[PDB]
Each structure stands twice: as structure tokens, then as C-alpha cells.
Design a binder for this molecule. Sequence first.
Ligand code: CUZ
Ligand code: CUZ
Ligand code: CUA
Ligand code: CUA
Ligand SMILES: [Ca+2]
Ligand SMILES: [Ca+2]
Ligand SMILES: [Cl-]
Ligand SMILES: [Cl-]
Ligand SMILES: [K+]
Ligand SMILES: [K+]
Ligand code: NA
Ligand code: NA
Lengths: 586, 586
Amino acid sequence: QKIHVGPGELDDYYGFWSGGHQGEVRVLGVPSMRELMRIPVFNVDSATGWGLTNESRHIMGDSAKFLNGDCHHPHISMTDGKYDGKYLFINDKANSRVARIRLDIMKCDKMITVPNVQAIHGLRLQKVPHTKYVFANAEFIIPHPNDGKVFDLQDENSYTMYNAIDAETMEMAFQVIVDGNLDNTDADYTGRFAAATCYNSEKAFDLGGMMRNERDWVVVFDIHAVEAAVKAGDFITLGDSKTPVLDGRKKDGKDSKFTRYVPVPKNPHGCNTSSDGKYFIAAGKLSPTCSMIAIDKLPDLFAGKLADPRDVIVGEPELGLGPLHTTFDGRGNAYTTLFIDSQVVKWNMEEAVRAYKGEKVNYIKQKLDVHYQPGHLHASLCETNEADGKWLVALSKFSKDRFLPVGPLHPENDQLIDISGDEMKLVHDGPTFAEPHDCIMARRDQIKTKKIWDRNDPFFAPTVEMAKKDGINLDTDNKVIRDGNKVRVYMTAMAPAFGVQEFTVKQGDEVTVTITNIAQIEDVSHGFVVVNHGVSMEISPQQTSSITFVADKPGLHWYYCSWFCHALHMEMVGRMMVEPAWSHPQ
Amino acid sequence: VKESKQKIHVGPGELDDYYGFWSGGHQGEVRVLGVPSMRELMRIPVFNVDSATGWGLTNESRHIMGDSAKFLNGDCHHPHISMTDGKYDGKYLFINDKANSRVARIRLDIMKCDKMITVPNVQAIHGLRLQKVPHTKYVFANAEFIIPHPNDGKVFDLQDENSYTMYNAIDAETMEMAFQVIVDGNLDNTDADYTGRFAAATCYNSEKAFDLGGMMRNERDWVVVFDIHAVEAAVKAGDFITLGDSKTPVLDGRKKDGKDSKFTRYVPVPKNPHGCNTSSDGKYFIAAGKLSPTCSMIAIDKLPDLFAGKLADPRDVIVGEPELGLGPLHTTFDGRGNAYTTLFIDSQVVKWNMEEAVRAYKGEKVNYIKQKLDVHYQPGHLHASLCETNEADGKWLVALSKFSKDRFLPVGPLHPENDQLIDISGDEMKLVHDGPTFAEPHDCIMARRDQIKTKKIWDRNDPFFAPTVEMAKKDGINLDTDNKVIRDGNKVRVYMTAMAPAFGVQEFTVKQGDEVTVTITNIAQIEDVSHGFVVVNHGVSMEISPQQTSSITFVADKPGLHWYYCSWFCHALHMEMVGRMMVEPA
Ligand code: CUZ
Ligand code: CUZ
Ligand code: CUA
Ligand code: CUA
Ligand SMILES: [Ca+2]
Ligand SMILES: [Ca+2]
Ligand SMILES: [Cl-]
Ligand SMILES: [Cl-]
Ligand SMILES: [K+]
Ligand SMILES: [K+]
Ligand code: NA
Ligand code: NA
């Protein structure tokens, strides 16, 4: 398997890395492991202006006031259990959001703050018949309402919820109240079932409390039952949110129609659907095991045909210390990170099942040392029925001595491992910033990107509507619109000249600058920076972008094009002249 | 005969040979790479807001940024490492911000920005380089754009006698201004000699024009040479003025009725010259012709005669003007007598011999051009290892090219820069690696592994958080031991230690509207065991590495229970390293 990509060669896969607490999404080439692009999401990007521009702040909504995010879990939309390459979704644990990235323009195009919850952690997508729902875990138990009268996690109105978002509209679809809490989640290959791990069945807030129970569980959701209750109007709402809320808690030991709780040791973490659709596999973490839930026993479980929820468990292999996550080669082997033992363990799922029935058999095939303390791992196409068994990435949390010293803060070590054969082979150590937790790979032919924007793209359609009210034709006009103490500058941009090279305003005016890059070539980006005003944005071919700032300083203020576009790029500049306040009405 | 055949593969467990410090371009950070692997080992936030470490959110970072903490953007170009006796000493890295007119200093032992200055009475810090000999006493910085003085909105005319820009000298060690020199025209790039007496800067806008045609009118602009000794003498004698409310000594380096200043000489050089690079043998200031297909070589040892009025014509210090190709922008050196220049139009690196160019300028028929290597595409800066020092080792060359086109997988309308690693150890340049990068790093600098020495854990006396230690002292707090909540009206100052896997303060209660400061001291002594702190749905995030104290301030504006958690995976029980803020309603 080609390991190195030389000058002029292309990578064979796209990799989409979470940015962790840095808040962006990163696009890598695999197997070179080089970063090809950064996609700002919850971070503020000085380069493109994401978080500064009107278009990006419109997408972020009120959450544009936050300059931080914490993302863990990127996933690609699917149709019939295969990537369709339309969208990538990712969580924000810090400010309780889900974001959608359009993979044709490689930008976040939608973002939602999940109502009535704290901390969106686990996230994964419906596989079949396609990604109708984005499933997302809120990790922390809170009071409802959370108005400061009740703080007790044991109150009957303290709980967290499972969250389903409509992938296409990026509006909430429903929420399910659960017992305990929620960690990671995955979905089956039928559309009926989803599952999530819980580690705080104790509803405690201290370390010892959260470890009290020998088993927590994975909670299984019957989405068909949830949808049926929603259509029937059998739901409630919380606070000011219209999201249908269904109650998936037990009451007096009796199960709800929406959930079943399978006892699983212990503070389990990863929750991974095998690529043959057979199992939800939960990583035992504090228990040295994984628990294998037979998806084809779930209908019987929900129909009272089983005596004990544990009856849906058909394997519980002992693997090593600190199992966190599992992935799949598509040849019937699973791969699990051992955080404490600092290894990846390769094991055969069907032999673990046979061992659980007492048939003594060694289901462990190999243990590979990684460096060090691995969290997530990802095999190429593992989340689809096309799992190809070629590449594996294990994302480790302590790199110690594997890279040059760079001070007290160390990079992470994401190691690329060749799994095309019987023996796992460590091939590359990839240092990364800010703790990517998880990543996802896609074949090159599964991603189709645009090189020039469409003029009707929804990303800036609101800006086009604003332009229309001013009588502006964005493709041709270079005009300064005045409206009280607001100034709206509309210009075209074409290397190496701004279409409006100077304009004059009053001190204190609120200035919006809208720029349309009227170029037709590829890779001809322009920028716009106003010196000493904290103003910066990108405009790529056929894109319209805009930004708003207050001209709070009298005098002459230069603006310039930031994106090197030309031999005369140093010279693509303009001037904003600000008349002093003492010369205008006080 | 000697071949170019260095290894570029750095396998698992092997370490890079050099550090690379890349500018973050319009994204605003500095990036630490390993060379020759070209992998990114660390990101150092400077002018960007970093969600991961909290740079731009924490009190320590906003203290360093001062009032400029209000800006969320920067635009970097030119990273340089401090020198002693013309060799890198590994103490500091400096970098410019063109967007908000700043210079930042990075401490290379902790890999953090530790000082920042907004340069007074200028717009757009672009060109930047360090004094070499006897050490980096001054940071020299170009303000690119001509502005009115004062810039109070009375005069906008850039031809006015009080419209100009200035050359800036910052005291490298105190990061206070040392002096400014008014110049004719504008300033592009700058470098310094190997004695401390002279510095020089290219000027592309000798015309003081605002339009593209106006800026290209003069057949020749110049490089302006500064007699720094003469500037220092005048400051010591008190022969200076000050501008506005800045105490910075200001010297007038303009020509007056054709009469030269004591501080400057203007050497005519074609055309809109751009790069300004000092050869590693200290013989030449080499100015790249850009619009002229040449480089101009200024003999540094003729400059004393120039300033003494011993030379008939300022062109007499020009001793070479090789013709190289289309669009020469920047030059670097292998220490063997060759220069390497980027040809932006021809899209090449041209290797040429400086002493042979000097002889050609006298009329000898000698071919000084050795090789032209195609690069991909449109190179700007380039950098050979240790080129800025008398130890230039002739091993590696990076050319930083602005259009990557088809050299990487497509990733939408925006494309990465192509930073290409070239083996120059032998007679033939050899292209060995294409490195995609984000946001146009413009330039980079390399250092031997043994020139950089970093701390593995923080010193408790570190100036970086000394103001926080002082705050703690005023509250009677011992940061190494204490877990306490101080109440001060509507202000709450929480102080806690942190150790995997538990915050030293796991709950605290405040009043809605209180201003909360959380100060955390990581009392681990194990390398690489960093913790984080995130307050859910409050926009609060920061890093605390071993023995560091970090603090962050936010308003508790939402009643109810609000979770905080450790963002840095630190322990098998990382998910459970959490606490609760309880906010009582008003
Ligand atoms: Cu958020 S957890 Cu194992 Cu996913 Cu990192
Ligand atoms: Cu700022 S310019 Cu040729 Cu240096 Cu990039
Ligand atoms: Cu437009 Cu550089
Ligand atoms: Cu401290 Cu994770
Ligand atoms: Ca538990
Ligand atoms: Ca000129
Ligand atoms: Cl998982
Ligand atoms: Cl230069
Ligand atoms: K780490
Ligand atoms: K570019
Ligand atoms: Na939205
Ligand atoms: Na300062």
C-alpha cells in the first residue's frame, strides 16, 4: 500500500479531523496526513473572517457571541449505509451546538444551539435509508427548568436528553428524556434503532459517585416508536422550545415505549456499530471489556420476548486495560483502543461471540503498541457497509518524546496504521494541535467540491437580498449607499484593484463593506482588511462577502487585499476617509 | 561533484533535524514545524483568538495584548529569530501584524507570545527583521502606508508635507519603542548588516501615489539605507521630536531640497523593488527587482564612504545587477557563495553565484546563473536553513508558492499555499516535498534542533502569569496549595489547584450577574499532563499546563446550574473531571 505521496501525486482519501477544543474542522489528505484546508466552525478565523463577517454571524445566530467551541465527533451523511458526501456534521461540547458543513464548498452552512441541554458530546448519523436524523447526546444532567430554584441532580425534574436534529433543515426533530446521562452514540443499518452509552447512571456529581455502580448501560432507542408518538401528538414541550419531548425514563421499574436499558460495565464510553450491521459494541473503559449488543435481538427485547435486557448481549470479550473505542475492517475483525495499556487490539467479533457461549477460543489476533494513551480510532469507511479494511488512524493523547520538544504543551499523536493485511503495521506519526478526538475518512471519489461559487448560493443569499433593497446589482455595481449614520459600500473585486478605491464617512458611522469577487478563474481569492479596525475577510471567485464595523477613528484609514493574488498584490489597496465628529452635528 | 541526497523520511520514533517557524499569514498565529518531515508540531497563538488555550480570552493573554485585545484578527508575514554575534541564540521570535499595526515577541523556551506592541503613529507593520551584530538589540519594522500627521481628519492629502510613513526600531528586550525615522516614499521589506551600523529597506512607492498606475510610474524606486549609529547619536543628544501622545524619539530621514539627512541615503534601484536580503557573508544588501527582471546588490562595505560624502553618486554602492528572470521577489543564501531567488512570473527558483554576478556587472563574460528549478506555482518568499546567520549551512530550502492549483486534492473554492522543500546540499537543487498550508504563511525561518531549548514544565516565577500571582498575593492566596472562593461585592475570585482527575474546587455558588474570575494552578510535575477549563454555554475556555497558573473572567448572567469540565484529555477518568457553578437568581 502506497505510504508516501510525492510531489505531484495526490492522496487517495480525504480525512476530516475534529479540531477538538480549538473549534474548527481540518481537511487532511490520506495517507500523506498533510492538512489541506481548515474549515472554521466554532472558532473565529482571522483569515476568512468567519465569526466577523455578516454571513458567518448569520449562520451562528446568537451564539456568534462565543469565540470558542469544543468539537469531537465529525460524521459524513449517508444514503443506504454508504457515504453520499453531501454534509459533515460535528458537535460542540462547550456551547451545546451542532454544526453542518457543506462538503461542496467546504464551509459550515448551518448551526443550531440545542435547546434545554448542556454539552453536546456524542454525535452520529442515521445510516438507513439515509441520514434523515443527526443524533446527539447532551452529556450533563441539569434541572428543568434550570432557573436557580433547584440544583439537585436527584430531583425528578433533573435529567439530560437524547437529541435528534433534522439533517436537511438543521432544526430540532425531537428530544428523549433518559435516566442517567449520555456519552457516545451510534445507529443501526435499518433506521429503527439508535444506541448510546451512559456512565453516570448514579446521577452523581463527584468522582466516587459516578463510579459507584458496577454497571451503567447502553440505552437503546426505538426511533419508530418515537416518531409514532410525535405524529400522534403524544409529547410535551420544555420552556420556550417547540421541540417535541418524549419521556424515555423508567417509571417504577416499568420501561417506556421509547427506550430499553442494557446493563453494561463500567462507565462505558465508545458506542460503535459494526459495519455488517450486526452489533452495537460498547467499550467498557473501567471494565477491561467490550459488550456486544446483537441488533437483531432488539425487536424481541422491545416486545417483552426476552426475560432480561442482558439477553441482547452476545459477547463481552476481555481485551485489556481501558477500552475506549472500536472500529471495523469489514473482514469480521474489530479494532479497539486500550487507553491504559496504550495499544490497539485487533479481535474477531464472531469468535468473541462463540467464546461468550463457553466455546474456548482465542479471539484476540494482535496487540499493537501506540504512543501514547489512545482515545478514538477510525478505519477507512468503517461507518458504512463499504468498510474497506485499508487504513486505520489511532488518535493518542500523550505524545511525550515522539516529536521534537515544543514547550510544556505537547501535540497529540495520530498514528496511521496499515491494516490491509493480517498484521497491523505502524507507518506514520502525525502530530496535531488541540486534541482531535475522532476523525473520518472518505474515498477521493466520494467528495465532489466546487471551484467557483454559484451566484445564488444560500451562504450569502441574505446579503443579496439586502443588496436588492438598495437597488444594487452585485455583479456590476460599485456604489456607496448612505442611510443616516449607516454606510453600505458595494463593490466588485478583480485583481489587482478594488472597484471602490476610496470612500468618505462621518466619525461614528456604521460601515458595511460588501465585496463581490467577479473573477471566473480558480484559486483567485481576494481579501479585505481595514487597518487598525479589526476587520478581515476572504472573497473567493463569484462569492459575495460582507462585514460591518464602526468608523470610530477620524482621519485616513487604509484598506488592503490580504490574499496574495498577483504580482501587484502589494498594490491592491484603498482608502476610507473619516471626517471628524467635531465637524458634524453633535 | 557533490550530489543532493539527504533523507526526508522521518519515521515513527525518529525526530526532525530542524525546527521550522512558519508565519500564520492572515490567520494570525505562528506555527512550529519539524523539518524535513514538514509536519506541524505546535500552534502558537499571537493575533488570533485560540479557543483551545484561551489566548485572547484569559487574563494573562489579554494583559499581554493590552488594548489590542479587542481585535480578533492579525495578518502575519515575517518571522525572525534573535541573534548574538550573527548566529541564532534561540531566545525570541518576532513577527509583524499588518492588519492592526503590531509587533509580537514569542519566547522560544515556552513557545508563547510574551510581549506585544502597537507601533504608534503608523499604519500596517509589514517588513520586519532583526539586528544581527553584536546582538538583536533592535527589531526593525516597516510601516507600509503613508498617512497624515496628525491623522485627525483635517488633511487627507497624501502629498501633504506632513503625510509620510516611518521606519520603526523596537527595543527587542523591553518591547518598547526605541525610535522612528521618517522616510520619503513607502517601505516594503528590510534587513540589517553584520556590524550593527546599517540597515536597509526597499521602497516601492517612492511616488507617494494611491493608485496602481501612480505607484508604478518611477523607473526606479530605491533602497533606503539607515545609519543606525547616527540615529542613536541624535537620540542620545536629544535631537529629535515626538509625534502626538507617543514619547518615541522621531528623527527626520527625508531629503530636504535635495539635501540628504544624516540618517539616510537613498540608493536608486528598479523597480518597485521588493525583497531586501542580507547575504550571509555580510557583503551585500540584495534587493529583488520585481517589476525589473533583476536583483540589485549593494556593497555594504561601500556604505561608510556613501554616508561620508566620499562617493560621487549613490549608485556607486551598487556592485551587481544580475538579470535573472521574470518577477524576482526574494533571495536567500546557502553559505557557499550562491544566492537563490524566487521568480514569481516564471514560477522558478534561480540559483546564482554572487561574486560572478559582481564581475559580470564590471563587463566580464561570465555566466553566474547555475540552475533554474520549476516550482508550483508563483513563489513569493524562500528560505534556506540558517540563511540569516554567518552559519548558513546550505542544506534545506523552502519556497513558499501562492497558487497550488492541482498539486493537492481539491477542497472547494479556497486553495492551500504550496510550501515546497528543496534539497540544496549538493550541486543541483532537488524538489523533495510539497507542503500544503493554510492562510498563506508568507515566510518561514528554520533553526537547528540544538539552537532551541524549551521548558518541559513551567517555572512558578514565570513573568507570563506574574500579574496573576500578584493578584493572588493581594487576596492572601498561596496558588500552590489553596482552594478558596473570595467574595468582593459582585466580584467572585475562585482559586483552585488542579490534578488529574479532579478540580481542587468542584462546586461554587454565585449571584446572577456576579463577575467571576477562575484562577487554576496545575500542580502536576509530570510532563505533558495538561488540563483544561470550559464553562458550558458561557464562552469560557483555557489551557493550564504543568506548573502553570491561568485565569479567566466572565459574567454569571444565567441563573441555575452550569457545568464546567476539563477540556484536555488527561486521565482515564477525564470525562468525570467536572464541577458545578450554581447561580442564584436575582
Ligand atoms: Cu469526546 S470522547 Cu472518546 Cu469522543 Cu474524545
Ligand atoms: Cu509580506 S511580502 Cu514578498 Cu513578505 Cu509575503
Ligand atoms: Cu487581491 Cu492580493
Ligand atoms: Cu483534566 Cu481531562
Ligand atoms: Ca457509573
Ligand atoms: Ca514605485
Ligand atoms: Cl464512539
Ligand atoms: Cl525580504
Ligand atoms: K494532549
Ligand atoms: K493562496
Ligand atoms: Na441555525
Ligand atoms: Na505591550
